[PDB]
Symmetry: C2
Subunit: 99 residues, 2 copies
């Protein structure tokens, strides 16, 4: 897993009403000049709650990992995840937690 | 300075018209439940562009550092920075960059 044991413990594979997805985000070389999480917060009215991160600035660009929760309506959440991927941020929904 | 060499090179101590603050954020036990950066994006119409981050999760809360640029109008970035400080995120303006 190499997520925190607290999350190993509460994570549920199956969605459930007003669950919240726990995400693993992977940056693969974006410029810092792309404000992707700040844009999703306004555009999709979601909150991206950072759990942890190992984000490296290497070669003048961004390569690394973040664990987050994404809070918002189900439609907004799905749209934000897809838009992140459409900008080549890899996104894995690791499972779902409460609220 | 202890930031990436290209930022060290570009960093100005004096604020200039349309400059961009380069921030260091230090997390010292903020809960994962507080959507600090997402809320500033909406509240103050700024972008928090992550440069790098080494953030750990422990006991339900967060510890570590992030380097960012903050983009927005002068009054908006001033208000977002003041609000993060008001909410006890340790913020340091390392200097200013184009553009």
């Amino acid at each position: 897993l190499d997520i925190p044991e607290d999350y190993q413990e509460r994570l549920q594979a199956e969605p459930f009403t007003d669950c919240v997805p726990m995400l693993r985000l992977e940056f693969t070389g974006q410029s810092v000049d792309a404000p992707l999480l700040s844009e999703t917060a306004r555009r999709f009215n979601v909150n991206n709650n950072i759990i942890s991160a190992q984000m490296d600035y290497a070669g003048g660009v961004k390569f690394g990992i973040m664990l987050t929760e994404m809070h918002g309506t189900q439609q907004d959440t799905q749209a934000a995840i897809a838009w992140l991927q459409e900008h080549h941020v890899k996104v894995e929904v690791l499972g779902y937690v409460l609220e």
